[model samples]
Target: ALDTTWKEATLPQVKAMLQKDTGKVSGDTVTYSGKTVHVVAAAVLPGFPFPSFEVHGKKNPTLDIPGGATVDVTFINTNKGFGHSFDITQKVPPYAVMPVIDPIVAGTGFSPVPKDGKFGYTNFTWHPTAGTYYYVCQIPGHAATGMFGKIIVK
Candidate 1:
């Protein structure tokens, strides 16, 4: 029997618990009492050269969201062979061969954590204005292999 349910836990305690339970989480958007979470997991397809973001267990999921409101994004590297990172860009696919540089909104960069960094993840905030953008893995050649997703902010 559990002594304390999650509802009775402090904010920090709840946040800490959720952080480690990301694998069990799913969906295009997760909303709490006064917050939301967009869990983007780095995933791989057997024949693909690299792993891409997954939402609702979708490969390179297309994320559609409303604009103006701030969003909380939690990125987790679920790949076993390589490190992964994430960032938003305006440059459409067929991304620059090395480094998906150009137009990464400041404060929206989450790193390619080490390959050995199992269970490593981070939270980032993004505020989008009506526009189309992309979230890509920032490793060289990662996005080139289509390790990216679509963001339609309306």
Candidate 2:
């Protein structure tokens, strides 16, 4: 038999349930009773030659997280007529192409916008080492087009 729990539920339904099980969004971030740091993938604006990606609506934003922090990422695609994805890795920027590095969290893969235009999201959790990391889009040419940011673990 199929698992009926989420079979008929909408995306928001699953999100709400997970928020209850995991954590809740507070301001621009989500916290699970100080147990996890929630990061929502912010936006992707259309641009020629390179679309801009942002977290909290800023390009190349910095995420200063404490060491040993548990991070839960909710990646939502809001680009018009374009597929997008996110990834966290140790690679730094200013490269012509995406490199082969160990990813803290693999890309969610490109996803088309849903009918509602607000119903697509991917989630991941990571326990990162105390260091710097890059969060970027893995959709070819996307990262090179300024689709990267910094995650500083102190």
Candidate 3:
């Protein structure tokens, strides 16, 4: 068992852990803890009709967890001309789909953390079993439009 103050660690350390657990020799469960994680989605200046824009930033698309556990996700809109939200689906390999009881069900699931903050963040300790996991933004047609990513549970 590993013990340390992860909240005081740096981003590089987190990124390394994420990369190191890419492939596992045997089936083992990996657990990690983090302090701060800001998940954000952005829209273009005018909120155009086609080609919805994504707020581009390494910090936005990626999450840095202390001890090298990095998660990079791309945010997208399901309806370019309507409303939607991000949905966590368990339809991939390795990891089982553990449904989140509280989901972000407002404005395409890409809205910023509320200024007042009422706890809608997906910041929870996750223990991924050895396998492949699939994560995507389920805002109508977003997944079909290429908003899916793979998680390696090593």
Candidate 4:
């Protein structure tokens, strides 16, 4: 079930929640008991018409991670227009058309596309159980346009 409480929590509160659920961290790596949680960032493509947005480098754009893993996601905004953000939820393909819910992981808010020919990015962390999660842009209409992908925790 979705943790709706996180929707209203402050960043510090969210951090505390993650720490409580996923355990400690050293630098960018999350260490739960004795296991290492791998962290990586992926690119998100944003565009108009709502279904053109997508993940940049992969055909499926699905991220596969181990169960009980604490993933620190660095969302690289590769969109050439408007601002964009990333959030992870349990929804699927029609996810682009769905309302924003309590995300298991959320990036550092939305941001305009970088104009200096540089990549704009935000970060967030999540410890997911064995399941499928959808990563979508939180900007209105963006997700519906295709700014989404999947994270499979096994």
Candidate 5:
């Protein structure tokens, strides 16, 4: 189940992510460079409801994207406090410390958002081939903690 349907009393930060192109931000860069924007943000807020993602308006959603679409990639993080990170990991879970990232069409793990929420965001571009991938919080114990989602490029 690409389980975005789970109910967890959405938070303000989550609501913020859902608000598209409001002149706020897509991580560090919201240039809206006229690309297929995909914000794979959020990875369980302290496991309050379990490690999850807010991508494509769904939690742990399955992203079936068209091949060869240039996408504006954004990632932001949290704490030892369960601060989270994001990446397009080449391997699938039961991962071990998040096995790096996809060679291309992928973004490396961005810095985890600190507990204080000071400064943490990432901006990148992506154009992937038709392949399968996993989006997981690149934090140790985070992915295995249930913070992993799917991206199947078609």
Candidate 6:
């Protein structure tokens, strides 16, 4: 059970780690062992930059599980060649825009996991509210490039 915030992260560092050239998980790194499940960088691919594609696993997204389950999520910032940010929002609805959960929410709700190139994890036993959530980089127009997804918690 580790708790951290993204207030200490630098915009430059986040951009570098997410660059398409980097092509690796940025900032803090985290590895998983047996029985442990983790999600990395949404599932975006390298393209133009900013508003990149929303990376998604073919398996889990909304993270729906029974009570008393231990779920660990590792947010990875990958760089295919340019810098970008990875954000996750737990809100649902009309989705006026993609990637960025709610542009009106200010700075975006999904905080930088590592704060500065360090791996971070959230281990809790809960279920997502019934709705569609999205993970994307709110850097200007990153979402249009193709960084967005829908996580349905049924």
Best by TM-score: 2
lDDT per residue as tens, model 6, 1-154: 1223333324454343334221122222222223333343432333524444322322122333223323344344433334344444665433344443543211223434333454322222223344545555555555655555443333
Q: In candidate 1, residue 75 scores what lDDT? A: 58
Best by lDDT: 2
lDDT of 4 by residue, 1-154 (tens): 3222212333344333323323333332223332444333333333223333322223225565677756655444454666566667786667535565574444456654556555454445666778877777666766766666666677
All models, RMSD in angstroms: 9.4, 6.7, 12.3, 9.9, 9.5, 9.5
Q: Give the clash count for each candidate.
A: 1, 0, 13, 5, 5, 30
Rank ordering of all candidates by lDDT, starting from the highest: 2, 1, 5, 4, 6, 3
Q: How displaced is residue 24 in candidate 6, in Å?
A: 22
Model 1: per-residue lDDT, tens digit, 82-151?
6566777777877876864576762234344334323455666676777888877766777887888777
Name model 5 segments beyond 4 Å from true: 1-17, 21-35, 45-48, 78-80, 97-105, 110-112, 115-119
TM-score of each: 0.65, 0.67, 0.33, 0.58, 0.64, 0.41
lDDT of each: 0.56, 0.58, 0.32, 0.51, 0.54, 0.37
Off by over 4 Å in 1: 1-37, 45-49, 106-117
Show the colliding residue pairs in model 1. 84-112
Give one digit per residue, the lDDT tens place, for model 2 in 117-150.
3545666677878888887766677777777777
* TM-score head-to-head 4 vs 5, winner: 5
TM-score of candidate 1 to 2 decimals: 0.65
What lDDT does model 3 reach?
0.32
Model 3: runs farther than 4 Å from truth? 1-88, 92-122
Clashing pairs for model 5 are: 77-113, 78-83, 78-113, 79-82, 79-83
lDDT of 3 by residue, 1-154 (tens): 1111112213343233334322212222223334322233322213433323232221112222334333332222222243333433346423223333233211224433223211122222333334544455444454555444333433
